[PDB]
Ligand SMILES: NC(=O)c1ccc[n+]([C@@H]2O[C@H](COP(=O)([O-])OP(=O)(O)OC[C@H]3O[C@@H](n4cnc5c(N)ncnc54)[C@H](OP(=O)(O)O)[C@@H]3O)[C@@H](O)[C@H]2O)c1
Ligand SMILES: CCc1nc(N)nc(N)c1OCCCCOc1cccc(CCCc2nnn[nH]2)c1
């Protein structure tokens with residue numbers, strides 16, 4: 001069965017969304033990359049963010065596959081404290097306040113930027129990957145979401161590869 005979910009979330013004059021994929025342990029990144037491959041999550045990330053402003057930390061920009069840098073179809077905003085940073089086809093901003101000026105914004109990583117943006121977020125789109133990768137020194141980590149967050153939990157699904165995952169759609173006022 002499909003998680004008979006409404007999939008509806010009202011919005012106000014500002015919508016700040018966070019979107020990430022995490023292992024059970026909260027690991028989201030390692031060695032400059034994501035330590036699994038999940039086609040359905042790539043498709044999910046693309047469909048949620050298409051047509052919107054996306055905000056990412058400089059290390060997440062570095063981690064994009066060079067052929068989809070900038071991510072097409074989205075206004076790419078890179079957060080860096082390097083005034084001279086070269087992000088061809090994107091814009092570089094020096095502060096989170098300026099990065100979140102678009103009326104709709106999806107924060108797409110990484111660990112540092114999720115943490116700083118979480119107080120302003122009203123949606124979290126989380127892919128939980130059922131992989132038992134323990135946290136290691138240097139890992140990038142997903143935020144811990146408290147009980148101000150509410151929403152819907154999807155059913156477990158298998159990718160054709162056999163990797164198991166599920167989608168959480170969280171929101172708050
Ligand atoms: N699983 C997922 O969903 C997912 C999503 C995205 C990324 N990732 C992975 O996460 C890792 C990257 O995450 P990360 O935490 O190491 O780095 P990050 O959050 O992507 O980027 C950190 C950089 O962003 C800049 N920065 C951070 N806060 C800033 C602020 N308030 N103002 C201006 N600049 C700011 C700094 O750039 P400068 O050093 O240039 O000053 C900082 O070094 C990679 O492994 C990536 O593959 C995973
Ligand atoms: C996909 C990982 C991911 N998942 C979720 N749920 N949230 C994220 N923030 C997130 O990270 C995306 C930004 C960092 C890594 O970027 C990518 C890594 C591997 C492949 C692609 C191209 C995926 C297809 C595509 N998307 N847009 N055009 N094509 C991106």
Ligand SMILES: [Cl-]
Pocket residue numbers: 034036037038039041042
């Ligand atoms: Cl992937």
